[PDB]
Design a protein around this nucleic acid. Sequence first.
DNA 1: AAAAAAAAAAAAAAAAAAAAAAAAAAAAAAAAAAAA
Length: 137
Amino acid sequence: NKSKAKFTSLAVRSLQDRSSLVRRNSVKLLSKLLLKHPFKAIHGSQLRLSEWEEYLKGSESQLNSTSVLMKLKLMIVYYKDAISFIKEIHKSIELISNLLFSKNRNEVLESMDFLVLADAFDIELSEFGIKKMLHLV
DNA sequence: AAAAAAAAAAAAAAAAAAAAAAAAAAAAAAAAAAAA
């Protein structure tokens, strides 16, 4: 699970690569990572930045107010990892939305598939991606 | 006191060649058809 964040960061960085095939494969990797993630034990299949931030704030308040110490520590580090992953996915979504207008059709199709998958899970910036996709006519 | 002969502007066509636009070669990914 730890290497998942590294793979996501490398894929987001490679999204800006000059080669088109590399970009399509990075989009595929991000789609595969978003389709199944370890972040499903609690409130699975729902990636909302506001809700996760509120949950993290609640956990921080609970810790501020024997097993309790490290249990809250693990919960907080898990929530921080979730927030970082959500931010990375949001940045990747923005990059792919900017990347929608490409000469190669396979890249466009994979970008549309990734945006649809990201829209399937409730995402605040998914509507922007759908709006950008609407101009593909 | 016309008439050859040399010098000089004016003007055709001809030869030239490397630089750039356009097309082919090579490796790899994707889509369709055939065999198990």
